[PDB]
């Protein structure tokens, strides 16, 4: 994808980590898959990790979520042969000053 | 290189990323190369990333 929006684009994706080798073989067919995400200022290679973890929300495998900000006139390349939760909707944003998150349950008016 | 100058030494290097597999095989005569830099407090292993990028 090429950034032509003249604004920073927030791109989110994920890598799937099956609990056992059977799930990985039954989903991606290979047993040693690779995910690569590259950009002019972001480069990272992911390798799926097959491990058994405690059941959270009735799931043993995990999906690790990642994000990056694309400058205007920049590109991002997604290359994988398995264990990729591909992005579908990206967000174009422009930062305005500094703020924070208020943790409260008060009425809003 | 062993630092015998009694002062800290700044070392600069680089890893080349060819655009296509053809260029990787012309300059390096291989297609899966590796760079390793190891010191007593710095160690990283670099693998070339072959992708096409804006000119």
């Amino acid at each position: 994808y090429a950034n032509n929006k003249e604004k920073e684009v927030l791109v989110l994706w994920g890598v799937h980590h099956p609990p056992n080798i059977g799930d990985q073989r039954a989903l991606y067919h290979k047993e040693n898959a690779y995910v690569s995400v590259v950009s002019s200022h972001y480069s990272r290679k992911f390798t799926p990790e097959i491990a058994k973890r405690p059941k959270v929300r009735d799931q043993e495998g995990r999906i690790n979520y990642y994000w990056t900000l694309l400058e205007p006139g920049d590109t991002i390349i997604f290359e994988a042969n398995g264990n990729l939760i591909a992005p579908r909707y990206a967000f174009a944003l422009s930062r305005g000053f500094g703020s924070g998150i208020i943790n409260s349950n008060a009425p809003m008016d």
Side-chain angles (χ1 to χ4, degrees), chain A residues 1-30 33-75:
Chain A
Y1 171 78
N3 193 6
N4 53 55
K5 301 240 173 180
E6 291 139 24
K7 274 174 334 173
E8 282 166 358
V9 170
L10 180 62
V11 183
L12 309 105
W13 71 90
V15 176
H16 184 211
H17 299 311
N20 43 30
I21 187 62
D23 284 3
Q24 159 105 48
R25 270 202 244 98
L27 265 173
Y28 306 115
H29 301 315
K30 349 227 158 356
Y34 94 97
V35 174
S36 150
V37 181
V38 86
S39 189
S40 42
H41 292 307
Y42 186 88
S43 266
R44 218 186 166 190
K45 257 206 53 45
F46 312 92
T47 278
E49 166 57 72
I50 322 287
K52 207 157 177 65
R53 282 138 278 210
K55 268 195 158 348
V56 186
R57 322 223 51 219
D58 284 342
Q59 288 291 351
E60 294 227 281
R62 319 297 223 226
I63 294 176
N64 290 352
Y65 311 100
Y66 307 98
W67 62 273
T68 195
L69 280 159
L70 270 186
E71 321 213 22
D74 202 348
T75 207

